[PDB]
């Protein structure tokens, strides 16, 4: 029921489940992902910056093919750094997703055990099973790629 309460909770993100999920695999597995992402994006900007500098600096002096060796070295080193950071980021994202899924499932199963009989009798069996199948599948094979794509 919306009641302007679930209505507002529908118009805006939860913003607290998201933070808990992001910080579930640890804290040094999060800042690593952000660090690598930001570095890779800045490098991908800087390579185009350097390409523009090289292209514009020698546009006029077509007969003079001088200083043609420094620019290429800069472009190649930037390309190598960009490729390495691209290789890093995907692995970091998937490692974070894997650890988060592991911890979530283990905690859920270790806290469902210490459950009162009134909880099991009152709560329909169908709901629990749906929670395990739907949440396990979504949190294991669906959230990492969505988060990576969004970022």
């Amino acid at each position: 029921d919306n009641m302007s309460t679930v209505m507002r909770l529908r118009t805006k993100m939860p913003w607290k489940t998201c933070w808990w999920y992001l910080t579930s695999g640890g804290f040094f597995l999060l800042f690593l992902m952000i660090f690598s992402k930001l570095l890779k994006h800045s490098v991908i900007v800087a390579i185009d910056y350097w390409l523009a500098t090289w292209t514009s600096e020698y546009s006029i002096n077509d007969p003079g093919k001088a200083d043609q060796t420094f620019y290429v070295a800069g472009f190649s080193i930037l390309c190598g750094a960009g490729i390495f950071l691209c290789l890093v980021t995907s692995l970091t994202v998937e490692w974070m997703g894997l650890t988060a899924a592991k911890n979530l499932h283990h905690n859920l199963l270790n806290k469902i055990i210490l459950g009162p009989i009134r909880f099991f009798d009152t709560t329909p069996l169908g709901l629990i099973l749906n929670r395990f199948s739907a949440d396990t599948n979504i949190i294991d094979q669906h959230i990492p790629p969505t988060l990576e794509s969004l970022t």
């Binding site: 185009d48 093919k65 390309c79 691209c86 055990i113 790629p145």
Partner: protein, 97 residues
Amino acid sequence: YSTERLKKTNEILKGIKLLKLYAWEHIFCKSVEETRMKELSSLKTFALYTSLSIFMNAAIPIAAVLATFVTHAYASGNNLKPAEAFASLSLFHILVT
């Protein structure tokens, strides 16, 4: 492996009362725990391969740009002008998808 684990979890959830009373809360939780460990050791490979896919999709275009630009230097005689370089980068970004 997920289906196997789900069958085991439903078997340890449907018959819950006798389990709780008979001091067998952990005996039928360890089986699901072991099957869950199997599930993660099967899903790690999936995560590895999908990360590899993302890496390649992000990295092949930049390597293509690098090769296509370094090739001109040795291949050609005259300097390269922006009106071709930037058009070609836009063309690569159009072609990638």
